[PDB]
Design a protein around this nucleic acid. Structure first.
Ligand SMILES: [Cl-]
Ligand SMILES: [Cl-]
Ligand SMILES: [Mg+2]
Ligand SMILES: [Mg+2]
Ligand SMILES: [Mg+2]
Ligand SMILES: [Mg+2]
Ligand SMILES: [Mg+2]
Ligand SMILES: [Mg+2]
Ligand SMILES: [Mg+2]
Ligand SMILES: [Mg+2]
Ligand SMILES: [Mg+2]
Ligand SMILES: [Mg+2]
Ligand SMILES: [Mg+2]
Ligand SMILES: [Mg+2]
Ligand SMILES: [Mg+2]
Ligand SMILES: [Mg+2]
Ligand SMILES: [Mg+2]
Ligand SMILES: [Mg+2]
Ligand SMILES: [Mg+2]
Ligand SMILES: [Mg+2]
Ligand SMILES: [Mg+2]
Ligand SMILES: [Mg+2]
Ligand SMILES: [Mg+2]
Ligand SMILES: [Mg+2]
Ligand SMILES: [Mg+2]
Ligand SMILES: [Mg+2]
Ligand SMILES: [Mg+2]
Ligand SMILES: [Mg+2]
Ligand SMILES: [Mg+2]
Ligand SMILES: [Mg+2]
Ligand SMILES: [Mg+2]
Ligand SMILES: [Mg+2]
Ligand code: NA
Ligand code: NA
Ligand code: NA
Ligand code: NA
Ligand code: NA
Ligand code: NA
Ligand code: NA
Ligand code: NA
Ligand code: NA
Ligand code: NA
Ligand code: NA
Ligand code: NA
Ligand code: NA
Ligand code: NA
Ligand code: NA
Ligand code: NA
Ligand code: NA
Ligand code: NA
Ligand code: NA
Ligand code: NA
Ligand code: NA
Lengths: 337, 53, 132
RNA sequence: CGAGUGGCUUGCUACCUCGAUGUCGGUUCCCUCCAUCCUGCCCGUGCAGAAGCGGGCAAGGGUGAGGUUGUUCGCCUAUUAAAGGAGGUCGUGAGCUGGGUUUAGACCGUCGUGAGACAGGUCGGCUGCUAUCUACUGGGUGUGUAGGUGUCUGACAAGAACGACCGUAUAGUACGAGAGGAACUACGGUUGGUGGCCACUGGUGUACCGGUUGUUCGAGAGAGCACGUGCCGGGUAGCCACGCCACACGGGGUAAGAGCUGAACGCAUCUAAGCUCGAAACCCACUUGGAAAAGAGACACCGCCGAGGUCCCGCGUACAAGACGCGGUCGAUAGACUCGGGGUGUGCGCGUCGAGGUAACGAGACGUUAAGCCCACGAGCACUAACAGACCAA
RNA sequence: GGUCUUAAGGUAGCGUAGUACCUUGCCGCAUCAGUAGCGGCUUGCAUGAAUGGAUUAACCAGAGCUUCACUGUCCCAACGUUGGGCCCGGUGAACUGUACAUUCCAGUGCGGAGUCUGGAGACACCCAGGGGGAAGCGAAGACCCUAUGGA
RNA sequence: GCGAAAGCCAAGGCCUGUCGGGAGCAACCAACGUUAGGGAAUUCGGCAAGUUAGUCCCGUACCUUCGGAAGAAGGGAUGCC
RNA sequence: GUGGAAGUCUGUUAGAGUUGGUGUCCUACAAUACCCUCUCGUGAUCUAUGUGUAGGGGUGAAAGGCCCAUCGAGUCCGGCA
């Protein structure tokens, strides 16, 4: 008869090739509801620990009781919006119109960009406002970058740059909001965007594992029984039928596994603090000691320690926000042992 | 809580609770102790154990 | 069914032999099926704490032997996680024969029972000696 | 009784292959069809309810586990929302398996004078090849677009990224004489699938520490060998699943269907023109890839005698070559050292005790000693090594 | 039927057999479920006495079955060890090759096409892979039939 | 040690079962170790792997050609000083 | 108790054999090999050397087995183009 069975692995994350940018790029943004604001932030993965929380769920028969929750510690120091990019609507989608930059640059932004020495902020601003007058102004986003130097456990000083969208009330209002942030020095923090208890979407390039077989890469079975002793242990039965006489790309084969971008949905932000309250004893293995701006993400986060991870207010949350959850205990017990 | 074996404090959100045949209960703070116990050893006779200390 | 209020790692399969923790006259039970459970190609149907499973009597009184009854998994050796993160495991695998209404076929329950089993089978619970 | 469709069965034909297109069943892995088993939306009922029966749209998803048999089929059991059928050389042997069919050996029955036969049964009885092309999975080097850095856009491409069940409230309510017994909605959980992660549990851990047998180095101390750890006990990092986290709703258009306004046909009519609704299906939404999209893109800044890049050196958040990413004295990139954090479980020696023994001798116990030994992690720390320097470039 | 062919007309036993077509025979044991296995029945398609029958302790790399124990055979895979695999120096074959060849979907054709026809796709080269296709490579098919062939 | 057995080591012989260098050294393969809970559900079939084990004491069924079955089964002990 | 019989037992003693792995190999190390597993191991035993039997003939505990990688009638050359 041959019993049915789902295929091995999702065909929705392909091609399973190495990622073009180690820095994640969201392909979606939250809707323009509330007041004007930057729709995302970034940080660096540190490690994991657990925390005891007070059941916050109003529908849980345990609401109000202790509860142990896993948490990923992410160092989230301030970032800097160094410019405001404007897009115009055209018959061929959105396209970058212009950009408004600043003059106050972080000491080592030149490790990545050819920092501007001569720019006309006003003209750009003008061009943008004219476009808006004509009604061709497409969404507005800020070119942002991090300050790895602010994070010791992270070797790199070369900042990571990524564009984040700015959603706000009216286009005029948030446009201004954008310009204001930038003009200053673009310096902003996790607090300015997220509040503990809110759900965010965390993107990141998963841990790389190089080339792997079908079994690990797609989760196909291993040869079973006698079949396992004949000369085949981790190779599939066949690459396909006689006809079509070609190998379909839908058949699980070997390749690059790991180091792929993934936007993990609805991650609850258990807490945003600063200091060394979350650090473990002995130090986060292969990472270091945390002591500064941090975020505690419920559960796991794609990527290995030290990798850049991005935050975005959840685009498709299932639950309502339950702000500032009570944290009764944060484990500092050594991750070694 | 305190480990019913070695006697050190069991880190919250950690450990296993073994329920005996009779119904008795034994909280272990680690596999190390569970295993030393399954070997039939008594925490008092092990010098590294806080009990013994 | 109602939330067990605990995460379980089924420690049993179709064909597993477990203990009958009651005085029904059945000593040994063989798991045959797991209520409301559908598996996947090649996977052996799995059962654990708090599952109502169909069973057959392997050992016991002649009149109880070979009879196909219904039952509730009361203990398993494999660990289970409680809300506070601690794990809990028992000394053996045991079940208690039950009827259509889920009332224990027997009069007395031998050995301890996991608290979680209460939030599902009351009459089984209100018949327990020790509830861990 | 009559008219058909399909090409799964069987038969017929003898067109194709006898300088061979490897058999049946099974397995593993991939795509599909609809004549739909379940799931969504509906119509009728001999539709009170509940449970059904029959029919319409509909292929998104699911359709599982076992006992006899080589079996397909089927018979049987317990679960289940349901445990649907069929195509791909009766998909799949340059993938497996080899129980069966169909070699040589042998037995039994039948037939035969006999050699020996059987559209009978039975025991045993082999699975070759280093991939040239093509195909696809992944990885690079070049050229085209025509200097560089950073950030984007989005033609198009993939997805099931989600499918399903149980429980609670609704409610012992509507309905019903009663027995019995719903729903909308809101909740909690399970299962199957998916992607990721290791604080926790668990596995490994021929790093490490300890115990111990045989033997060799005279004893001791400390060691080698006993298969790539002698065996046993414990086990850090890492890697993992048996562990943990995350995976909608809602719009838009439709089918079957329910209707509105409405004529041909003064009436009537859901349809002819027009309109309102309405499926797990379609489109969007969401996730992944995507300037080689030849209309070969956009923006900002830097630079054309210098911007930037390659080689080099110290290393990995990367890795089969290649690629990738980071650091390079304006430095914590790697090592040493010292702390922290961890694994073992109390070192050598010496002192006391020790069944005894004239004595020699003495297994072992306690103390010194959370000792001794050890660490793939963290910190501090420029002590050592990231020096010297080459090249390409409008 | 209550003898006829052709001499006799199956006795003791054993029997759904390694012999039983019907067949998964019927009943029972055993299992949740047993075309298996064992026991009983048995009209035996087509058992049977040195073509030896029955039965049988011991023996057996002989065939079938059940139980305890055991376990990575399985649920469902993971980690590790050694030798390869990958890169480098040296050594250095063979198989195979009408030609052309970046193909895919359909169609057509001696009815099983990379090459025909229509479309679609397609920048070149290279590395690694697992083997879908070249009705892949290997062997003038053992099967079948034919030859006024052979043994 | 029962041993012309294993394992270890002399004497004697050998580093010529004769190509090397490098990557924590990926996929895949050959040999193999360990795997929680379950325990034959795998499969034609328990194939492969595993379990058991030396020695002494106790004890040992059906059946039988009286030889045997039998090391039946099952239970206990085992070092060092 | 003595005695120490056996086509007797255990046994990688030496030696002989070849059951399963349908493992490794399958342009091999090899035109029949490698490893693990397994059988015999005082006898109808294994083995060296010498010697006899020759092709429609030997030899055969019988498989049409074997008679120099050649066997339902060896090999060589000839009949033979
Ligand atoms: Cl297989
Ligand atoms: Cl089942
Ligand atoms: Mg094989
Ligand atoms: Mg740890
Ligand atoms: Mg711990
Ligand atoms: Mg199966
Ligand atoms: Mg072929
Ligand atoms: Mg239809
Ligand atoms: Mg489909
Ligand atoms: Mg076929
Ligand atoms: Mg098929
Ligand atoms: Mg083949
Ligand atoms: Mg093939
Ligand atoms: Mg091959
Ligand atoms: Mg066969
Ligand atoms: Mg057979
Ligand atoms: Mg056969
Ligand atoms: Mg050109
Ligand atoms: Mg060694
Ligand atoms: Mg019978
Ligand atoms: Mg021929
Ligand atoms: Mg013939
Ligand atoms: Mg003739
Ligand atoms: Mg196991
Ligand atoms: Mg079976
Ligand atoms: Mg099966
Ligand atoms: Mg065996
Ligand atoms: Mg003998
Ligand atoms: Mg012997
Ligand atoms: Mg001779
Ligand atoms: Mg013959
Ligand atoms: Mg010769
Ligand atoms: Na093998
Ligand atoms: Na092989
Ligand atoms: Na084929
Ligand atoms: Na041919
Ligand atoms: Na087949
Ligand atoms: Na469907
Ligand atoms: Na079956
Ligand atoms: Na074929
Ligand atoms: Na084959
Ligand atoms: Na086959
Ligand atoms: Na709709
Ligand atoms: Na371009
Ligand atoms: Na006769
Ligand atoms: Na014999
Ligand atoms: Na194994
Ligand atoms: Na191929
Ligand atoms: Na040499
Ligand atoms: Na005598
Ligand atoms: Na052999
Ligand atoms: Na002759
Ligand atoms: Na001649």
């Amino acid at each position: 008869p041959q019993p049915s069975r789902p295929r091995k692995g999702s065909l929705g994350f392909g091609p399973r090739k190495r990622s073009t940018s180690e820095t994640p790029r969201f392909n979606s943004w939250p809707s323009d509801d509330g007041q004007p604001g930057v729709q995302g932030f970034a940080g660096y993965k540190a490690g994991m620990t657990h925390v005891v929380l007070v059941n916050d769920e109003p529908n849980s028969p345990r609401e109000g009781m202790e509860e142990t929750v896993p948490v990923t510690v992410i160092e989230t120091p301030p970032m800097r919006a160094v410019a405001l990019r404007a897009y115009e609507d055209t018959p061929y989608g959105q396209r970058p119109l212009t950009e408004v930059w600043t003059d106050e640059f972080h000491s080592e932004l030149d490790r990545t960009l050819d920092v501007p020495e001569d720019h006309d902020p006003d003209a750009a601003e003008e061009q943008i406002r004219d476009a808006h007058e004509a009604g061709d102004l497409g969404d507005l986003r800020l070119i942002t970058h991090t300050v790895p130097d602010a994070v010791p456990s992270v070797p790199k000083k070369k900042p990571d740059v990524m564009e984040t969208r700015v959603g706000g009330g009216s286009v005029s209002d948030r446009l201004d909001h954008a310009l204001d942030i930038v003009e200053d020095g673009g310096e902003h923090a996790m607090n300015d965007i997220f509040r503990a208890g809110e759900y965010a979407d965390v993107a990141g390039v998963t841990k790389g594992k190089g080339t792997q077989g079908p079994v690990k890469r797609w989760g196909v079975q291993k040869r079973k029984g006698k079949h396992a002793r004949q000369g085949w242990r981790r190779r599939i039965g066949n690459l396909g039928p006689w006809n079509p006489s070609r190998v379909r790309s839908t058949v699980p084969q070997q390749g690059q596994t790991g180091y792929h971008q993934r936007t993990e949905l609805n991650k609850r932000l258990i807490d945003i603090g600063e200091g060394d309250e979350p650090t473990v004893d002995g130090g986060f293995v292969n990472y270091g000691e945390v002591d500064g701006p941090y975020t505690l993400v419920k559960g796991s986060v794609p990527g290995p320690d030290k990798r850049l991870v991005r935050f975005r207010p959840a685009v498709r949350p299932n639950d309502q926000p339950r702000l500032d959850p009570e944290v009764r205990y944060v484990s500092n017990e050594s991750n070694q042992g | 809580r305190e480990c019913d074996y070695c006697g050190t404090d069991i880190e919250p959100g950690t450990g296993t609770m073994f329920v005996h045949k009779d119904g008795a209960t034994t909280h272990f703070c680690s596999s190390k102790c569970e295993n030393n116990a399954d070997l039939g050893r008594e925490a008092r006779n092990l010098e590294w154990t806080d009990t013994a200390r | 069914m109602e939330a067990l209020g605990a995460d379980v790692t089924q420690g049993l399969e179709k064909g597993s032999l477990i203990t009958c923790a009651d005085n029904t006259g059945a000593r040994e039970l063989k798991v045959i099926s797991v209520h409301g459970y559908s598996g996947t190609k090649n996977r052996h149907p799995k059962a654990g704490l708090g599952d109502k499973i169909t069973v057959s009597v392997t050992k016991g009184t002649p009149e109880m032997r070979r009879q196909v009854l219904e039952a509730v998994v009361v203990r398993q050796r494999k660990p289970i996680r409680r809300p506070d993160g601690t794990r809990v495991k028992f000394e053996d695998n045991a079940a208690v024969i039950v009827d259509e209404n889920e009332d224990p076929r027997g009069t007395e329950l031998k050995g301890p029972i996991a608290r979680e089993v209460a939030q599902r089978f009351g009459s089984v619970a209100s018949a327990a000696t020790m509830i861990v």
